Amino acid sequence: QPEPDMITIFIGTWNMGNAPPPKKITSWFLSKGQGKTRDDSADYIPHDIYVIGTQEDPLSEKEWLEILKHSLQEITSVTFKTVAIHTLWNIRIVVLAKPEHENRISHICTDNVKTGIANTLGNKGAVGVSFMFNGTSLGFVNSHLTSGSEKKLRRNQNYMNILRFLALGDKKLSPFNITHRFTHLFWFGDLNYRVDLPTWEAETIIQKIKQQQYADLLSHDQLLTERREQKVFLHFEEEEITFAPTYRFERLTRDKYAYTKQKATGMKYNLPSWCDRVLWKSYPLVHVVCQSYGSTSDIMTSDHSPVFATFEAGVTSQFVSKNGPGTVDSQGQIEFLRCYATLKTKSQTKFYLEFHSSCLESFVKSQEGENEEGSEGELVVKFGETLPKLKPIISDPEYLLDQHILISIKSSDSDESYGEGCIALRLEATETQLPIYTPLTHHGELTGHFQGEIKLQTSQ
Ligand SMILES: CC(=O)N1CCN(c2ccc(Cl)cc2)CC1
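That is the input. Now the predicted structure with WNY docked in place:
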């Protein structure tokens, strides 16, 4: 049986509004309703992995597992295996996989982050799951962020606390947060970003929704505008939104948005909004294609509609050679030429590089670079031709060109990372000097740039 080079992943996010679901929710797992929907011809074809994120979920893990497994069995005739389930308060993530993937899945991690202090600590945060699928690392985050049109800054803060403190993936990758630990990272949930228009425009907004004219609404979506100003979800992607706002509905219909202020809303308006979202971040030059992004029309127990997204995602096999794993393969090497880091830091310490990759037996520390002043105030750390020669465990190009090198630039004084990035080894040529580039981030904020040239030697 050949190992897959592609899998499909279902992502669901649903704020259940503390109500039990209706008896049928199959439309969710089938990507049927509004937006980018899945072809009817695919309805009996199971996804490889289903990742279900709920918020305001009133169910026990057992009650939800029963409904999810029975739903997928009715659709696919497959009894899915439970990879992981993790609940923080009423925030839940479930990961289900086809039985044939049981022995492809390992290194399962779960964690949660609680956001807010005192007042604001008590019900918002995130749950996450990671695991290996053969040679590919996968991370999944379900977050319920701060509510309210006037709290987009709080939401961005919630996001930064979640990506700093969620402890998923390989702990040996210690300079790296979850935005660098995975081949593919999927971040979804009730992110609670709103359509930022005046309250007096509520009926206009509804009119525009009834005409399926979303352009003028999405131009005011706080998540899109905050992402465009690099305030949140830097280097993440989201499929174009072609479905109606998923919040806030009157329960037991989809014919009405409930937007007016009420005691039950803390006297806040809830203008129709895309609260419920799916974003992703994959390593450079890895196959990932969104095949669906939409909302259901026929699940009305909550004041939110469920959101689905599906993805084709590139995966690799668990590679074994005569040499590595367990030794180096002298026929392989990774060399860096003319490398320099540009950092935004106002500080003056020496810096060195750390290279981390599963193609190395362990992480490599470079010599300190030479600090120079850039022509516009910046710190430029020059490595020149001084960076070590990296010794991959396997030289076969079918393995090595599919790998990535994570880079941290660290203070000699503190050994704290000032930036993190990632370089694909999917080069246009081997044994050829080629340009490489990554932005550098710390706590998911832009801190600099790493560029230079690479020279990759494989066994071919
Ligand atoms: C030794 C042990 O108890 N575990 C628990 C979780 N295991 C698991 C792997 C794949 C799938 Cl689909 C489901 C579950 C592996 C490790």
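Residues 1-325 form one domain.
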